[PDB]
Amino acid sequence: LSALNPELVQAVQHVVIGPSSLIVHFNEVIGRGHFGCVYHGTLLDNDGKKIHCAVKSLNRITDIGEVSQFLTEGIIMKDFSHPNVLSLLGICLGSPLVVLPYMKHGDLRNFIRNETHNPTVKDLIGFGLQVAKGMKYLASKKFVHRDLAARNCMLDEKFTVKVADFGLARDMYDKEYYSVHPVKWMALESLQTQKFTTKSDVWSFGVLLWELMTRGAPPYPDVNTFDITVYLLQGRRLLQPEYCPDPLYEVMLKCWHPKAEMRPSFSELVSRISAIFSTFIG
Numbered sequence: 001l002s003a004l005n006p007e008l009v010q011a012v013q014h015v016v017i018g019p020s021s022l023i024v025h026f027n028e029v030i031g032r033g034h035f036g037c038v039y040h041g042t043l044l045d046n047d048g049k050k051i052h053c054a055v056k057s058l059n060r061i062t063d064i065g066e067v068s069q070f071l072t073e074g075i076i077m078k079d080f081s082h083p084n085v086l087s088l089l090g091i092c093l094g095s096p097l098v099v100l101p102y103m104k105h106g107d108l109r110n111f112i113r114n115e116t117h118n119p120t121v122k123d124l125i126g127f128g129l130q131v132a133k134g135m136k137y138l139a140s141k142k143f144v145h146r147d148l149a150a151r152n153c154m155l156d157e158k159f160t161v162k163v164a165d166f167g168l169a170r171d172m173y174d175k176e177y178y179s180v181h182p183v184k185w186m187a188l189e190s191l192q193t194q195k196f197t198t199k200s201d202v203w204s205f206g207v208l209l210w211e212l213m214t215r216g217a218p219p220y221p222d223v224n225t226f227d228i229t230v231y232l233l234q235g236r237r238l239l240q241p242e243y244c245p246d247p248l249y250e251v252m253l254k255c256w257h258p259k260a261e262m263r264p265s266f267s268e269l270v271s272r273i274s275a276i277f278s279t280f281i282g
C-alpha cells in the first residue's frame, strides 16, 4: 500500500471506505454462491446510519499496477449515479473490496421466472421502462454496457430495477470451480465485427424487453449460438410474445433493425415506452 502513487491516493480518497466504516460478513454470501464471492456487509455513513451492502472481494488483483487501475475504475464509476443503475458505494483497500448497494430481490430474470411472484403486464413494461432509463443515463455518459440482458439487472427492496454487471460490478456470474473450468443478445454487427456501441446495446435492450414480456423465456431456444448470425441475416427475428402489446412489439423490432443508425436511441425508447406504460390501468 505504501508503494501507491500519492497523487492517485489523493484522487481516490472520496471513493475509499475506511476499514472502520465497514463490517464485512465474510461468513455469509449473497445468492447462495450464484454470484461468486459477494458477501453481506454493513456500511456506516457519516451520520452512523447502517446501510446493507453487497461486498465483492477482488482476489484476481495482486500487483500494485492492478491495484492502481482498480483505484481509477473506482474514481470513474463513483460518478455514475442514477435511480436505474447500480451505484458504487465505494472501495476498500487482504484483497481489495468493491462495496455495492444490496439488492433484496436479486436479478430481474430470476424474479420474473419465479412462480411465487405475479407481475402484471403493466409491471413488466414498467421494468422495461426502468431499464431504458438506466441505459439512457449510461448512453448519455458515452458508456457502452456490452452485456445487457435480464440476468444483468437487479431489483431492490422497492422493486426498483437497476442496470448492473458493468464497471466494478462486472463478472456478476463468474464462479470459481474445483475441477470443471451473450451471442443471443448481441447485435448482428457485433456478431460480425466483435465491436460494441450504444446502438448494439439498443439491440440487446430489444431482447431484454422480449425476456420481460415472456417472463424470462430463453430467446431462440432452437437456434445454435453459431447459427444466430445466419438466422438474423435471413431477416428472422424473435416473435411477438403472447401478452405483449402490439406497439411494444413494434419498439422491439425497431431495436433489431440491421442498420445500427436506424435503431431508436435510448432517449426515444424511454419516450415511446413511457407513453405505452401510461395507457395501462394500475
Ligand SMILES: COc1ccc2[nH]ncc2c1
Residues within 6 Å of the ligand: 030, 031, 035, 038, 054, 056, 100, 101, 102, 103, 104, 106, 168, 169, 170, 172
Ligand atoms: C456484483 O454482484 C452482485 C451480486 C449480487 C448482489 N446483490 N446485491 C448487490 C449485488 C451485486
